[PDB]
Structures are given as C-alpha cells and as structure tokens.
C-alpha cells in the first residue's frame, strides 16, 4: 500500500514505521511454504560437514565459512545458529531445525520471494518514500527458531551496507508469523538514526573485520515492536535495533530485503556484499 503524510513524518521522526496488515495471510503462507521446500532441499554446506580436532582445524573451517558468506550475495545460502554445534563441530539437533537464516539473493533466484519483493505494494510504498532508482542490494529469511533462536544485538544496517552519502539504504522487514514480546520481536531506539554510524564492517582486499565500535546504550531507550503476521516494518539504515532470543515454543519467521537509492549514491567498495557481473543489484521498479 501507500504512505499518508503522517506516516511519512513518523518514519523520519522515528527511523522506523510499522505497517500492520501490509501483506495478507496467504502471501505470508506462500513464503513459509517455499522456505520449507528450500530447507527440505538444503545441502549442508562443506564447512559444516565435518567435526574438528584441533586449532588448525577450527581455523580452516572458520575460513571456508567466511568464503561461503562473502560469496553469498548472489546466492541462496544457509547460515546456522552459532551454538547448535558441540565441542568438536557437530550439529546437536538436525541442520534443518538449526538454520538461523538464508541469504542473500532470495529476491533474485526464488520466484516467490522475487514476486513479493517486486510486488505492486512494495513498488508503491517505495514511490511514497520517493526512491528514484531503488535497487535491491540484499535479501534474507530469518527463522528465529523456538527456544534458541538467536538474539541480534543492537546495530545499524549501514554499518554493513555502507554508502556515500548515508540515508540511502532502507530496510524492509516482513513478519511471516506473529512477532511477540515472547518470541523475539524487534526493538528500536526511536530517533537513533540521525548521527551516522559508530562502526562499519569491512571486507579484506579473504575476510571481514570492523572499523569503529558499537557504543553502549541504555536498554531503557529501546521500544518493542510486536506485530501480527503480514505486518511490514520499515527500517532506516541508521536506526538502532536489536531482537532478543526466542525463548518460546514457536518460531518468528520473517523475510527482509534492503533497497538502495542508486541516484547520487556510492556503494562502498569495502562492504562485504558487492554486486557480481552475474547479479548486479536489480532495480525495484518494473
């Protein structure tokens, strides 16, 4: 759908905006169903396929893992929960119960997610926001598995998807399932999106690292945004947000993608994600 002038100001004020009912139940279920099929056909990545003996083993595993992620910008790959593994690198429960996320080109290589992503609803919302040349830089599906579904510590999306100038990358988060206080809903600091980023993640000339550091911020400045299935949350590139671990007996599935306004904008050559000749960042508008 489409933004009223009061919704638009509320977004510039807060750095996020909750639009309940953005997608229908059946759109949500389309996503849940295709992600099931993708997970059912998942092959366990080479680096997770082996127990490790030593320090020399855990570092070679850690590197293939880095390689896998870095080259995942134009793929549909699988990223597993940090702590679903034992002392010697083995899965504690089956890998299909242990996925944390899938990324980072669902919007390009899956017909269902491409559909949702380039839908009329999204294209019209983007026009309300006034994006000239929005392109889709990234997408991903977050499972937030029950009981151990990982927390996401406070951050700003621009720390990872940096551009000159700032104010050019926008996050879209769609709730495929109900997001509650219990199961890992998002939290923001409203108004935190107006003094740049404290930290960025950079890629090596193979590897990643951080410039700067995330400051400490009083937990009391975060507000919860629980929402029902189908809600869309808009996320400014610089708003500070987090999610707690899912301590509940049900997941908190979500699909998210990021838009960059390509007009006058420089994508940092140091970002982990770079467009390939196979998939340059595709235009949103069709």
């Amino acid at each position: 759908a489409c933004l009223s002038p009061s919704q638009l100001q509320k977004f510039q004020q807060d750095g996020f905006l909750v639009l309940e009912g953005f997608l229908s139940a059946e759109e949500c279920v389309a996503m849940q169903q295709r992600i099931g099929e993708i997970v059912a056909e998942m092959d366990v990545p080479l680096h997770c396929r082996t127990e490790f003996s030593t320090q020399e083993e855990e570092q070679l595993r850690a590197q293939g893992s880095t390689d896998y992620f870095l080259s995942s910008g134009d793929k549909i790959r699988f990223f597993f929960e940090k702590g679903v593994f034992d002392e010697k690198g083995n899965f504690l429960v089956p890998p299909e119960k242990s996925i944390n996320k899938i990324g980072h080109a669902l919007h390009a290589h899956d017909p269902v997610f491409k559909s949702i992503t380039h839908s009329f609803k999204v294209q019209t919302l983007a026009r309300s926001l006034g994006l000239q040349m929005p392109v889709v830089v990234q997408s991903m599906y977050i499972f937030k598995q029950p009981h151990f579904g990982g927390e996401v510590s406070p951050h700003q999306d621009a720390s990872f998807l940096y551009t000159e100038p700032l104010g050019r990358v926008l996050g879209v988060w769609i709730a495929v399932e109900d997001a509650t206080l219990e199961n890992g809903c998002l939290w923001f600091i409203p108004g935190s999106h107006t003094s740049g980023v404290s930290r960025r993640m950079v890629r090596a000339p193979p590897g990643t690292s951080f410039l700067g550091s995330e400051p400490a911020r009083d937990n009391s400045l975060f507000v919860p945004t629980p929402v029902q299935r189908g809600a869309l949350v808009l996320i400014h590139g610089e708003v500070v947000h987090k999610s707690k671990q899912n301590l509940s007996d049900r997941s908190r599935q979500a699909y998210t993608f990021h838009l960059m306004e390509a007009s006058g904008t420089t994508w940092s050559p140091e970002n982990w994600l770079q467009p390939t000749a196979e998939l340059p960042f595709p235009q949103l508008y069709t």
Side-chain angles (χ1 to χ4, degrees), residues 89-96 98-163 165-232:
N90 307 268
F91 287 96
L92 295 169
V93 299
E96 58 269 35
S98 313
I99 327 177
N100 179 272
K101 70 178 150 186
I102 292 175
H104 287 85
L106 283 160
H107 69 278
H109 302 318
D110 188 79
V112 169
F113 289 98
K114 180 177 197 176
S115 176
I116 293 284
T117 303
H118 296 275
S119 72
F120 184 61
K121 283 166 172 162
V122 181
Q123 291 194 59
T124 50
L125 175 80
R127 296 177 143 119
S128 316
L129 292 159
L131 317 187
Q132 303 311 287
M133 205 135 62
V135 302
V136 189
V137 299
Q138 183 195 102
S139 68
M140 82 199 143
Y141 196 92
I142 309 300
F143 290 81
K144 274 258 189 196
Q145 299 290 352
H147 303 292
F148 60 83
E151 82 187 319
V152 174
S153 42
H155 71 288
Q156 293 172 288
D157 289 339
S159 293
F160 302 91
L161 299 168
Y162 193 80
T163 59
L166 288 175
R168 290 285 217 281
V169 168
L170 179 74
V172 181
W173 185 92
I174 292 143
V176 177
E177 285 181 309
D178 283 12
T180 65
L181 289 176
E182 294 60 62
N183 75 353
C185 68
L186 295 177
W187 304 61
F188 303 83
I189 305 172
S192 50
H193 62 285
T194 83
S195 176
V197 303
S198 281
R199 163 191 67 138
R200 295 167 53 195
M201 167 169 268
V202 298
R203 176 168 206 165
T208 67
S209 60
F210 301 102
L211 297 157
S213 46
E214 214 51 36
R217 317 174 161 107
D218 36 15
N219 230 12
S220 58
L221 287 184
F222 286 92
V223 316
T225 74
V227 295
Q228 301 249 252
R229 156 169 85 175
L232 174 151

Side-chain angles (χ1 to χ4, degrees), residues 10-50 52 54 58 60-80:
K10 196 185 177 50
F11 182 62
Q12 299 155 21
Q13 272 162 9
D14 291 8
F16 69 101
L17 182 75
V18 172
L19 303 179
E20 295 268 10
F22 182 86
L23 300 195
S24 57
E26 305 80 33
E27 282 167 301
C28 288
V29 169
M31 292 187 284
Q32 198 165 353
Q33 173 187 62
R34 186 59 200 160
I35 221 77
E37 286 162 19
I38 297 167
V39 167
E41 289 138 39
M42 167 182 80
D43 264 281
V44 161
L46 172 59
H47 64 273
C48 318
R49 279 189 221 140
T50 22
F52 54 84
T54 56
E58 196 168 34
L60 260 160
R61 152 148 187 169
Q63 190 66 62
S65 179
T66 296
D67 305 334
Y68 187 85
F69 163 74
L70 289 168
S71 45
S72 79
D74 68 338
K75 312 291 194 333
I76 290 181
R77 287 178 162 174
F78 310 88
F79 299 95
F80 298 88

